[PDB]
From a paper:
The reductive dehalogenases (RDases) are key enzymes in organohalide respiration, which is performed by a unique subset of bacteria. The RDases are cobalamin-dependent and able to selectively cleave carbon-halogen bonds through reduction. The RDases can be split into two classes: (i) the canonical respiratory dehalogenases, which use a halogenated compound as a final electron acceptor during organohalide respiration and (ii) the catabolic respiratory dehalogenases that occur in the catabolic pathways of non-organohalide respiring bacteria. Structural insight into RDase function is based on two enzymes that have been crystallised, the respiratory perchloroethene (PCE) Sulfurospirillum multivorans reductive dehalogenase (PceA), and the catabolic reductive dehalogenase from [name] ([name]).
The [name] variant [name] was previously reported to lack 35-DB-4-OH reductase activity. Crystals of the [name] variant were obtained in the same condition as the wild type NpRdhAN crystals. Alignment of chain A of [name] and the NpRdhAN structure gave an rmsd of 0.179 over 680 residues. The only major difference occurred, as expected, at position Q488. An overlay of the three [name] [name] monomers reveals multiple conformations of Q488 and adjacent residues S422 and R552, also implicated in substrate binding. The [name] crystal structure confirms that no significant changes occur to the wider protein active site. EPR analysis of the [name] variant reveals a sharpening of spectral features upon addition of substrate, but not the clear cobalt-halogen interaction seen with WT [name], suggesting non-productive binding with water remaining as the fifth ligand to the cobalt ion. Thus, it seems that the [name] mutation disrupts the halide ion and substrate binding properties of the active site, likely a consequence of the disorder induced at positions S422 and R552, as well as perturbation of the Tyr426 pKa. The extent by which the [name] mutation disrupts substrate binding casts light on the critical role K488 plays in this enzyme. Unfortunately, crystal structures of [name] ligand complexes could not be obtained, despite several attempts.
Residue numbers in the entry: -3 to 697
The structure:
Amino acid sequence: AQISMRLYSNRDRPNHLGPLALERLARVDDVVAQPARQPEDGFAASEDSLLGDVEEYARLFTRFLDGPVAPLGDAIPDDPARRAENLKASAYFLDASMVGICRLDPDDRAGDCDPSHTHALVFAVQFGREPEAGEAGAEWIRGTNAARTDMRCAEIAAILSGYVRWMGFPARGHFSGDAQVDLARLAVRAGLARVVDGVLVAPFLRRGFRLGVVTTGYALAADRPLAPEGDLGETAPEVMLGIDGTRPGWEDAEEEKRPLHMGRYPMETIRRVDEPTTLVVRQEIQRVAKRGDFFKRAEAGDLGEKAKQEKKRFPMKHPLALGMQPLIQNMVPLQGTREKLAPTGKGGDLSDPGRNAEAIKALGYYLGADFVGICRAEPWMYYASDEVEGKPIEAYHDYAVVMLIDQGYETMEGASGDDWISASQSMRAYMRGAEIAGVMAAHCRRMGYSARSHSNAHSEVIHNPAILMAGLGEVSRIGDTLLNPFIGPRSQSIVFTTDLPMSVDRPIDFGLQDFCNQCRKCARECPCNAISFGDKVMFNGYEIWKADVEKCTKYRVTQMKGSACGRCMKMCPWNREDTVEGRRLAELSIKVPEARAAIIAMDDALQNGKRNLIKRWWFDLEVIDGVAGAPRMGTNERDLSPDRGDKIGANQKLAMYPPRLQPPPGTTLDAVLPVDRSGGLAEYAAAETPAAARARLKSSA
Ligand code: B12
Ligand code: SF4
Ligand code: SF4
Ligand code: NA
């Protein structure tokens, strides 16, 4: 039994308070400043180590600590208290461990800092868990924590400073690698740390931490420093049990009992199988032109004029997403190599693939992944041709390292799924995963093993079969999304392929096929009816619930009451809170088939998927012509929808686009292939049932 979960829900807790119970700490109005440095590692990092890679990505993010400042619109809220809450929530959303605000005095902006800056958003990121000595990959990680954590701080400072700049206010990010103000001094004044023997000590962050700061003239309500002496209250019973929905005081200690390479969720308790729960006929799977990605189809005109127009901006309507974009786009040149590499003898003992897998897994979790799985990168997982030159893509690497980034339950529980924070929920997981995989792929290359990552911005593999084969999800009704037994459908994946030899994981079986046969919630709640209410079909050689990717693409690119859409992730019953009750309801789903229908039905009865306005922390801002304003057309504020009735699965008719109905390999964005919807509808009426496939396959056995 895993006992580290929260006993208490955070459903009434606003996001600006964060996962720690900082409001229950002893505070005073001021404290006398005193010299102090940030926590540093206990050991130095060898040439076997990560260090050079996390320093490169910190240097990349440094490029975006300052930037162009948008014109001021008329929709930025005035209240410094609301601004504070929104910015603090923004920082926690990007996984700041601890956040605070303080006023800048003249002494701070007397340096290179812009002198119009009056306020500082201070935030700390806790050191990562490191492998114990003798565990695989320890020497990859030992002594890199300050730079790994500094990278993360530089990332968050870059995004948050750009978010404020896109709202019309000059803002500059600061971290150890590039600061114009005294970080430690502001960490104390903002109430994140105290000083002990000249080193910062923060409550709750027992592992050490590193700092980032965003200074700005954007006026904010300030916080107060910690009581400089004596017990702050960190172990009070309310904090220890986390009654307000916060991190239990025992969770750190319980966590450290598991090996780092196993992750935080108990995937070891999920049944493994040699073949996936759904049928995969490799000899019948054709490789798809990357020009068949319907975003690429929309870009090239295949879906009409409006989809073409909006393809570039649809996920970048919101200033927060616009803060992430420079990082997303400029990480692409660093994704890695396709040519074979000579082993360089760095990295310690790489002769045990079982140990290499553990080290890559430990490496992922250390860098902030939520799941890691390894499978082998089969040639049919690669696109046939790229979309820009049309040239063939090679199956150049042997293995795929697949990592899931949780999109975030609490933010989505306040959102509609298709409102102004949707694309920011995708894009956050997109850049965070691209970061992590860029760093790991780079470290594989340092060890002389070709490695290349595959981002939202540039992938040469299709993630979904790798998510399946790595045992991170099952085929779900949502269609082009796989569902994980602990975080449901609430994930964005990042992959990097490599030649580094690693033991592969096996597919998982947690009963989801039988569960989805009894559930229609995501299908019922989709704004454009893109999800199938019917049975699974055969599609390009594998069994799948085929969603209508044409309808979904047009909705995500074109709908004007939000930025993109991910509502089908919010509505699934497996989208649950990380509480004892939530894990138990998942356990029951997995272990007790006779209870699945009751859980499916009570998820609607208890009105799960209804919006929680406590959690609506973001501003509704649409950028139009480079200026952030109120939304032109409004804001999706959807709640639970009703029953399409008993016969919908027989009457819904969707379009599918297997390779036959796609642009052929070699086609480029320079060509236009209007989507053949009538053929896609007829195609899907004609699809083989998975049952017939198994019969037909059996006769050639
Ligand atoms: C463009 C795109 C979309 C498009 C169109 C996809 C399409 N079919 O053309 C629309 C615009 C449809 C889309 C929608 C969403 N998608 Co999207 N999509 C992409 C993207 C970038 C490319 C798809 C592609 O490469 N070519 C299109 C061709 C290959 O499609 P296809 O032949 O029909 O095959 C699809 C499936 O059959 C599956 N697949 C392919 N081969 C095999 C083999 C087996 C055995 C199985 C089981 C599945 C499988 O993968 C393809 C996904 O489109 C990928 C990122 C990536 N590199 O995979 C994600 C991605 C697949 N989608 C993702 C997500 C999260 C979404 C959304 C929920 C929105 C969001 N919050 O981001 C919705 C969900 C829609 C749904 N009903 O499932 C995630 C899925 C992660 C997961 N948990 O499985 C991905 C992997 C991005 C990521 N990095 O996490 N997006
Ligand atoms: S299938 Fe597409 S349009 Fe429908 S809810 Fe999911 S993301 Fe939104
Ligand atoms: S909403 Fe229901 S049918 Fe859809 S993926 Fe989730 S469990 Fe499966
Ligand atoms: Na739910």
